[PDB]
Amino acid sequence: MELKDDDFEKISELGAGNGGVVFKVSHKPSGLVMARKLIHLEIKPAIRNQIIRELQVLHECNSPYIVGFYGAFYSDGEISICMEHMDGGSLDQVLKKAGRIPEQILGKVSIAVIKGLTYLREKHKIMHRDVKPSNILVNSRGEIKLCDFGVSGQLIDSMAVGTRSYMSPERLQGTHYSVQSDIWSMGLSLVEMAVGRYPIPPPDAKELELMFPPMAIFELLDYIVNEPPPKLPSGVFSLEFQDFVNKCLIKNPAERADLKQLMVHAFIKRSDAEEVDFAGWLCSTIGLN
Ligand SMILES: Nc1ncnc2c1ncn2[C@@H]1O[C@H](COP(=O)(O)OP(=O)(O)OP(=O)(O)O)[C@@H](O)[C@H]1O
Ligand SMILES: O=C(NOCCO)c1ccc2[nH]ncc2c1Nc1ccc(I)cc1F
Ligand SMILES: [Mg+2]
């Protein structure tokens, strides 16, 4: 079925973020609850038909680790992307309530991100471009899925920043970047969720005892490109997890681990084996089921 503006009805607002707001909506003709992302674009009518045409590949983006797609259209000054409602929300939301995310839980998350990036790369030849906690969504059936990845090339162009960057050193320094940049983003996201806060600048020894002003924009970006990469703090995390994120955060992107290597890493093999009620932990910490 084709999706269209007057067939919808706002239930609530799921949140906002720099460009679009997303609503929990009811598609009246189907009865389905969806998440409708609206993106305001003051843009000519020729190229907003190309954006919709290129978003149609999301119908073939079927994966347990990728947020489902219902359809896309253009309304009155905004392009709508309609997707699976994830009732657990994004991992930046669950991090606020949880304080930290346990290491065993981040094992299941890491697996999901690797397998989702791998799906997008192998089957659709695209990189995410925007891996961070807010773009990793979870639900009460225990599924972990990626969204807001760069399918339509034209859509990226029409939106071309924020106080916290998950961009790799190489991407910050110029156009010389590709799929390896997503690895860096994931690594930083994992350190953040593990520790309970954005890991740049790194916490001093006294701030690490308490756990276990904000930087200016240039000061922060200068740290990412010129200062050594964030480490997972020793002792409280396993040696295999520390190595995992260290391989993800190697400044040199060719020296840095790629998806193939991370898939067979000791941390992933171990987390594959582990028995985790992720559904039960997720609902327990945010109050749902
Ligand atoms: N499919 C969805 N189901 C449930 N909640 C969603 C869904 N998509 C987005 N959200 C929620 O809406 C919020 C806003 O999302 P949006 O993509 O517009 O910005 P963001 O990713 O949070 O931040 P930024 O724009 O800087 O990347 C997210 O934090 C998330 O909690
Ligand atoms: O929403 C995007 N960014 O988040 C900022 C909004 O404030 C975004 C950006 C660039 C993009 N190119 N192709 C798509 C696309 C995209 N959305 C998107 C992609 C996959 C799914 I499943 C659902 C989506 F909504
Ligand atoms: Mg987003």
Side-chain angles (χ1 to χ4, degrees):
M1 179 181 194
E2 204 190 19
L3 273 39
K4 149 167 63 73
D5 177 78
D6 61 11
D7 286 332
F8 289 97
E9 182 179 39
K10 296 169 187 166
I11 299 169
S12 80
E13 192 185 324
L14 292 162
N18 201 142
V21 304
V22 335
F23 289 99
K24 192 187 178 181
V25 304
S26 183
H27 185 242
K28 294 206 258 60
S30 67
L32 277 169
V33 173
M34 317 188 329
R36 181 189 188 187
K37 164 162 282 182
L38 294 161
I39 307 178
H40 194 90
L41 291 172
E42 185 158 298
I43 282 295
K44 282 173 190 179
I47 64 182
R48 59 96 177 176
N49 279 304
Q50 193 192 342
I51 284 168
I52 289 163
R53 183 157 51 252
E54 286 181 349
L55 282 173
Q56 296 307 293
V57 305
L58 294 172
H59 276 125
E60 279 77 50
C61 283
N62 307 305
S63 176
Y65 319 105
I66 302 292
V67 169
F69 180 69
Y70 294 126
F73 57 89
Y74 174 80
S75 190
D76 200 339
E78 315 213 54
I79 72 99
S80 280
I81 298 169
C82 291
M83 54 189 146
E84 179 175 3
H85 170 246
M86 301 289 281
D87 61 4
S90 62
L91 283 184
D92 84 295
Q93 283 182 300
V94 316
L95 185 62
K96 292 175 202 292
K97 307 201 82 176
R100 294 174 213 81
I101 298 188
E103 177 175 341
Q104 302 212 153
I105 293 289
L106 293 170
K108 195 143 173 181
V109 173
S110 293
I111 285 164
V113 175
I114 288 171
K115 281 190 177 181
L117 269 30
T118 298
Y119 174 82
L120 291 171
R121 180 81 193 91
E122 295 288 310
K123 291 221 195 170
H124 299 280
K125 301 172 175 298
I126 56 147
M127 63 172 287
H128 201 116
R129 307 186 105 86
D130 200 2
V131 176
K132 61 194 183 182
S134 79
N135 291 350
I136 301 167
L137 280 34
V138 297
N139 64 39
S140 56
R141 302 197 300 174
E143 294 166 320
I144 308 163
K145 305 185 169 172
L146 304 172
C147 63
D148 300 348
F149 43 90
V151 266
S152 165
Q154 183 51 231
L155 221 206
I156 288 155
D157 297 345
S158 309
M159 305 196 222
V161 149
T163 182
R164 294 153 68 179
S165 195
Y166 300 90
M167 288 184 189
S168 62
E170 77 263 20
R171 187 181 174 161
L172 290 168
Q173 294 178 82
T175 55
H176 293 329
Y177 63 93
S178 186
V179 304
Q180 284 304 106
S181 189
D182 285 338
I183 301 304
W184 167 280
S185 298
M186 174 182 66
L188 196 70
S189 301
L190 287 167
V191 174
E192 178 181 340
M193 295 181 294
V195 172
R197 69 148 211 165
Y198 185 73
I200 299 168
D204 44 34
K206 288 174 182 174
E207 196 173 356
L208 287 171
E209 191 183 350
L210 296 165
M211 291 173 180
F212 311 108
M215 265 194 165
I217 306 150
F218 174 75
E219 207 171 341
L220 171 61
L221 297 191
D222 195 282
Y223 201 100
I224 292 167
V225 313
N226 289 319
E227 295 287 353
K231 282 170 158 186
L232 221 48
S234 188
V236 74
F237 298 106
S238 82
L239 297 169
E240 283 103 329
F241 183 32
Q242 290 165 59
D243 184 54
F244 184 81
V245 306
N246 289 353
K247 294 284 173 61
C248 290
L249 294 178
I250 290 168
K251 288 212 185 176
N252 187 321
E255 204 188 354
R256 173 155 67 235
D258 74 338
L259 296 167
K260 206 200 176 190
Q261 293 173 165
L262 293 176
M263 193 79 76
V264 302
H265 197 278
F267 174 68
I268 300 308
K269 290 166 76 202
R270 196 201 72 202
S271 298
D272 262 290
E274 279 164 1
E275 297 175 17
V276 183
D277 193 12
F278 178 86
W281 171 90
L282 185 266
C283 295
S284 170
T285 51
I286 75 180
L288 205 164
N289 193 303

